[model samples]
Target: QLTAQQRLLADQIISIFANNTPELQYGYAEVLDDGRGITAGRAGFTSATGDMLEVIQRYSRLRPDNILVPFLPRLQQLAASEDGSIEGLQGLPQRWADASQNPVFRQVQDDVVDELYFQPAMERAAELGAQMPLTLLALYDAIIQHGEGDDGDGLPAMIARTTAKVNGIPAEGVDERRWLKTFLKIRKQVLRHPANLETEDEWSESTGRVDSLMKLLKQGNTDLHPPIRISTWGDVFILPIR
Candidate 1:
């Protein structure tokens, strides 16, 4: 659901980053995620949190006035659907209009908006770093290959490669040992070749990979860390990266 203008905006943002490295590729994915879908765009941990931080920070550095002046208001408009009615939610405008008059809804909207959209975006913007995107892509590839088989669907793999390319990391050169060794390592290499999972199978696959990564991450600092959980509904994979 990316508008032409929105797509241009994302492209403009990506232009500032280098070639298709892991970090830039992650940035590309983050922008696409931020630009599309009302709810799905910002779902998952990285979308809710990491992505937001990346956009704001990067955008601010690249076009401080553009984001600070336009982006903020645009975010409010999209989130509240202020300019016009959203396509699916026919009655949302009226409800929002009515709710705007009430202090409770205003506060509720504020809270919900921040929790559902703003906070995550803001946090992601603030924490834009090279490592998170790298980590995200690496983790993503491992899971996709594990779930969809190495030769199955190329969509996920393509996305991962795109993330790497956008971020300036070589697709095949990422050193997992340095980046991934901090986490607990599980020895089981699950080769779900021709990876096809039923509803339950997908869940099991997503959790299995994230859970394994979580164990690796914990060994370094278990006290301050919590386990990372990823949930997938149908074809969508929602990773909650802490």
Candidate 2:
């Protein structure tokens, strides 16, 4: 559905990030970059949110960092929605459990669950949560609730608890699901915080949110080490490291 010009810009950004950025070599390489050496490449600086997200996911995979994995949950959440849910992951497992099962719904559920759920709850403790200054946490929370088949509203208490712990990584605090939930909250805020405003006031607000998200992404994923690439445009900004 994107226009030719849109596609071109998308390609340009992807090419820049792909070539200029350092990739995960083989094993145990850090996931994110500190966003250094960003000024060297930025030919196709103009692009849309979808394009940016696409490229972000592609490169994030090269490192398989925890912070980047939420993007998958975000995509899955989108797909599971009414319009996008045609590829929903709600019923994936039942299909395999029972060959005769519809699987149509179960497969989608299975896929999302596999990606979002933590085994025995303990596994959930490792992932990052939605924290201060990062608006994307709200967006991530919305997706996680939707993907898990919950109404996505019964997490205020958990959200608050996670919010309190935003200062630094806790020592032996919650389980994996809690961690995942916290991370989802952070991701939701990041995505839902809005983008590309036309007014100075709006741009200022959005920039604050973006700055928070960028900081959290860099801090949480030592492996990812995202770059702090900042560019000033009349209306929009070409953020650092996708």
Candidate 3:
């Protein structure tokens, strides 16, 4: 079981990646290259990839009375479009933003975050025997950014490659700090790639997050309790939740 402190730490770290805030908001939206269309909501659900539709369906299953349930068909239609350029989506960003405060939308956002990122991060941490809050947060952030698969330099592949470079795995008789440093190094390198730079300039700031975590690890701060201030890539995140 994850401690309360650990859960809070992970949530904050994910917020930095997803919304750049400690609080989760369901209305966040961004158009990105990997999304090939639109990435929306607290967990960054994508329209072209059908992830948004999946979340909507999942939400409908849980709450048939959800306001979004009535919009599923239209959302599905939008999702079917190859480039997510359906005329129907022109106003979706504003509509989604307006719906952000709805109770059902907030619930769905929380549920998706739990299912997609939190649970997977926890499971990965268990598999690797990583108990530190920072370690778990790092794993969660990686999964959120690079995804779970090995598809074209995803988190799984990055972990494998970094482990090889570091010569050992964390908690398996290797220095945990050394392992994380290597992983962060490779993550930065991936962000610096020409293709990624051309496709998504926003991600360039992500390397600063890794750098901040590295600083914490070097300082021997493992629990990641709040009242912590992290300055990354010109943005300052002040977590006053002590």
Candidate 4:
């Protein structure tokens, strides 16, 4: 199990992939047009995915009279909208950004991200016996992109295919580095060339996420300790950055 300190560093490293900075911007709200809709906060929770609703609801519980309370009904409707646009919600981004300045509101963002993304990722990594921080990074990215399920697009599905190709997991004596390298390749293929493309055109470009992970592995930064540089979406980032 990763200690609190270890996971904090790990989360910071992966935050570059999510928020494109080592610093988590609790107020970073925008519409990325990635088909996810209104990707916001530190970890980019999306309205279409319902995690956005969860975050907002959790925030409401902490402060009932919060500025976001007024827009809950509209956000709910937008979350269920077919196109996933923030069209009718005129001031949501500003209000969410405004609220994020408060420490309590910021903590709400962190709490939601840890609950929805970080905790489940650690659980999956522990099961694989993937001890290194880099391995954890790879698994966390998969969990975010593919989700936690047994479906074809789930992290388990990726793990199943990865283990089969390598014959076993790290705990079963498979070479952990080799296994994880193969895992990155498998994920890259799926992202770069999806089976079908009916909507936005960002997946093919986002394969750089996997590529950066692969490069870090090649550099033997398994521990993910300090002063690391990584590229995502063609931009280079040095960690411990804002």
Best lDDT goes to which candidate? 4
lDDT of 4 by residue, 79-169 (tens): 6663476666678788878988999888877887677777888887888888888888788877876667565656788888899999999
lDDT scores of the candidates, listed in order: 0.31, 0.31, 0.70, 0.77
In model 2, state the lDDT of residue 45: 9
**In candidate 2, where is summed lDDT lowest over 10 consecutive residues?**
37-46
Kindly list the per-residue Cα lDDT of model 1 for residues 150-182, writing each as its tens digit: 333333343344344444332344443342442
Q: Pick the candidate with the highest TM-score.
A: 4
**TM-score of structure candidate 3:** 0.83
Q: Predict model 2's lDDT versus the native.
A: 0.31
What is the lDDT for 22 in model 3? 74
Candidate 1 overall Cα lDDT vs. reference? 0.31
Candidate 1 worst ten-residue window by lDDT: 15-24
Q: What is the Å distance of residue 134 in model 4 from its true position?
A: 0.9
Give per-model TM-scores: 0.22, 0.20, 0.83, 0.87
Off by over 4 Å in 1: 1-26, 30-54, 57-62, 67-71, 79-205, 214-242
lDDT of 1 at 40: 15
**What ranking of all candidate models by lDDT puts the best one first?**
4, 3, 1, 2
Flag clash pairs in model 3. Answer: none
Off by over 4 Å in 2: 1-108, 116-124, 127-165, 172-191, 195-242
Better of 1 and 3 by TM-score: 3
Q: What order do candidates take by TM-score, descending?
A: 4, 3, 1, 2
Off by over 4 Å in 4: 3-5, 77-83, 149-151, 195-200, 233-237
